């Protein structure tokens with residue numbers, strides 16, 4: 483099965499998922515001098531005050547914090563989007579070293595990790611329908627750099643011991659994702675894809691310009707997770723990022739100049 487190892491990593495994925503070589507794959511390198519300022523772009527509207535987190539899960543390639551998406555509780559609108567997108571989960575990608583880990587890069591610069599808040603377009607009724615549409619998903623991407631600790635992240639860090647191996651889950655209620663946002667909501671946006679299989683080209687990417695800082699101790703605890711299931715040989719969950727893909731016939735737009 484697919485993963486991030488030498489024998490099943492991103493350069494192998496196209497054999498099972500031919501769309502890996504598609505025309506609107508993610509992630510990409512954001513060239514800040516080629517991105518076009520678009521004054522017609524609206525500010526992002528993040529409404530997370532009623533968010534209901536349920537569970538945190540190690541799924542074998544990352545850990546997901548899952549939300550109740552049966553109503554318009556935590557939604558994303560505005561920006562480049564038409565209509566209302568519901569938050570369903572967030573997860574991270576990170577590296578084995580502080581100098582790598584993000585999926586998107588900015589002028590070829592890598593960050594230590596990247597947070598993805600995944601939302602789906604409510605006009606399609608459920609998430610599985612949404613991923614089959616060109617405007618089905620909106621993923622908010624936030625860069626993590628190593629520096630001062632992020633207080634709002636610590637509740638996530640402290641529960642990781644309980645979901646060390648693949649398939650483990652833990653109740654995770656009353657988590658407020660607003661504690662993970664940067665001060666500014668300026669962004670780049672482009673049409674792209676899921677960055678893990680099935681790599682569907684259904685995503686409007688919204689990548690925030692301002693990174694958040696987390697401490698070395700916080701990111702260190704990410705790196706203690708396991709790709710494997712309990713009772714299997716230990717493989718540390720690190721470097722679960724896909725490298726940048728060709729931009730091809732797309733333009734990256736910026737909400738700011």
Ligand SMILES: CCOc1ccc2nc(S(N)(=O)=O)sc2c1
Pocket residue numbers: 598600613621675676677678679680681
């Ligand atoms: C369709 C089964 O659920 C999936 C599969 C892949 C996938 N990739 C992302 S990401 N890394 O935010 O682009 S969210 C997501 C959800």
Ligand SMILES: [Zn+2]
Pocket residue numbers: 573574575598677
């Ligand atoms: Zn992701």
